[PDB]
Amino acid sequence: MNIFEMLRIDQGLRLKIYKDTEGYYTIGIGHLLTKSPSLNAAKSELDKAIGRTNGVITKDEAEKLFNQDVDAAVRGILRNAKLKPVYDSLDAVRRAALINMVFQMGETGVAGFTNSLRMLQQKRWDEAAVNLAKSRWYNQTPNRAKRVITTFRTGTWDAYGMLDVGAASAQSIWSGYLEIILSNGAMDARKIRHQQPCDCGTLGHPSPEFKVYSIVLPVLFELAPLDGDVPEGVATEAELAIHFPECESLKVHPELHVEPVTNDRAGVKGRSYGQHTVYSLLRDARVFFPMEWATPISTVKSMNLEDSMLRVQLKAFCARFDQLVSQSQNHSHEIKLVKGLSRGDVGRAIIDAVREEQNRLQ
Amino acid sequence: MNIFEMLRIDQGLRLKIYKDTEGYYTIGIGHLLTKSPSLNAAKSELDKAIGRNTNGVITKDEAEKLFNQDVDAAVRGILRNAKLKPVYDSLDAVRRAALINMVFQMGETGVAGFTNSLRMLQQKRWDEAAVNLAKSRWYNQTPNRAKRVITTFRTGTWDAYGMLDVGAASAQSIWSGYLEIILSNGAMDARKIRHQTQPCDCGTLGHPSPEFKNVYGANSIVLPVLFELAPLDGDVPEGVATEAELAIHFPECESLKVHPELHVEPVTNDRAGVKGRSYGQHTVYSLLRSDSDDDARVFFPMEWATPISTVKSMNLEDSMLRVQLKAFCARFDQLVSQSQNHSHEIKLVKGLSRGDVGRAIIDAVREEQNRL
């Protein structure tokens, strides 16, 4: 990964205007806008900052805004006599770890770590990591401090997972659900149903009678917002924009669904698995596909984890989910995980995801 | 907890006679019966220990009676040992169990080898001793058990034997993702009983209709409680039990019967972009009603807690799975108990093994009859 992923995990990312801890309007990864109590005043600074917003900005814009902050923070480091020698000595990864401290505490704050910085400069990682864990910075935010400290000691991104909650949930959804339905048959073999009776065909080849409504995609889209912002329930067309931001032509078809897979498990006869609602996008001909949200994400959110820990586990969830997908045999391109930093980012990620699945078939 | 749960996690517990690493017949928590290769000799030796006709199958309270007999004998040998008596006497109750844990694993002569580590414990240098113990071969050979025993020495608490544990995530999984969803429709007693091939005015769990009592008995009673079975070793049966296979699924659950034709109505809900996902259609089980010694029965809905089966598929080390599943029951009971309107609608049946669950089910169902 990179320094951007590091701070999104440790600090978080917001693509809507929010009030920070002291109440001042901020965007992206902790980018201060104004000390004015006028929501419009901050928006005016935001509009000129990107040159476009209505208070909402995109992912690659927030990463463009982040790099502007990164260079300015590095600029101040070179202007600070206590932080210049250590930065010059550090390697690429450990430079990001020091930059994280400046983003959290300010250049004046990081300069206070006189003893800890000298141990880093003399490449005494174990010695420095023990001293950093004794500070007030560690006591205030130990989850973030542990990962930044672990980054200094080892120089790797390893802190950012066999017994992780996120990887266990990715293991939970694959073995306890997706593997069951995939064992039944192929995705193109899965029958399409109307809530009417229709011989509506299958996902791979929709029947000519179905073509009332065009192509249908035999791909299960599993949506994973990396901030855990999953909408509850299923959206009606009125609420569709609330559930799925920035999906231009998206529509929801409650009356159509993919047939569920019946299983016997844990003392339950005919447990229903993998019943999907069919959604469409503009291809006025449209593209129908079955998609659903990654349901462990909603449950892990209910555990009330610390915000950075929730982002850490969801990051492990997607990392292992893709790995299990890569090792999948005889089920090539049937499961696609749509990853987004926020719920809105998923909406834009859905559009390209469906386009790339069309191109492989067409 | 206590020393019994500590060793039950670290070593495991068996209620059937088994051969240990060296081939000797054993019961409970590493309790040697005989060095004879004759299974009958071991069964007779077990009978003399318990004062019963066991045939090799033992209960929890019997295995804990045998465990404390090993504990006292192990403490006695320690007090007879000049290298271990000063350190044992200085330690507190919890840290004493940790020292007893090492004796159970490697023997008094083995534990006596830790000359440097034991002296740090005697003069209360916890952090220093925990670092020195982690340098031994005992740590490299058995790292999961050594880590928990070392943490017990360092902190003097049972915290190592079960905040974001894998077991608690699965316990949150079943509560937030299933049980809470089903209960959001209404109370458990309001849930209707359904027949497979017919329409039956069968009533609800809280109020069984007169037609239901016509088919299954005029003294039949139905409990509006969902019994969630939790085997603490992860032994969950595959699939659903048939009438013939009932004994395999539920060992030593006396008079148990299964009614495939009866089921609790499923709850349809909207989740994760799914319209009307079907939830909680349960199989109805019955037991003979000890209330009135008759043929009248007690009907209840029962199923296994399937995250236990899911957690097993992650291929954890035996002791690590026991730690996580114990955390699962701790978080599952905590979530159920703290509910403000669903406290006695869900009852979690905990057992040390699958056989232990079979006897635990009866106690659970009898306990619900008296409450209602």
Ligand SMILES: Nc1nc(=O)c2ncn([C@@H]3O[C@@H]4COP(=O)(O)O[C@H]5[C@@H](O)[C@H](n6cnc7c(N)ncnc76)O[C@@H]5COP(=O)(O)O[C@@H]3[C@@H]4O)c2[nH]1
């Ligand atoms: N999109 C989707 N469609 C499904 O049909 C489905 N079924 C399961 N899952 C998810 O895969 C994983 C399988 O784990 P498990 O079954 O052990 O725990 C489940 C199980 O203990 C219980 N549960 C939920 N739904 C059912 C059900 N229909 N039958 C029996 N038990 C259920 O509650 C737990 C959490 O369910 P979800 O939190 O919604 O997510 C599960 C889970 O993350 C599904 N995901």
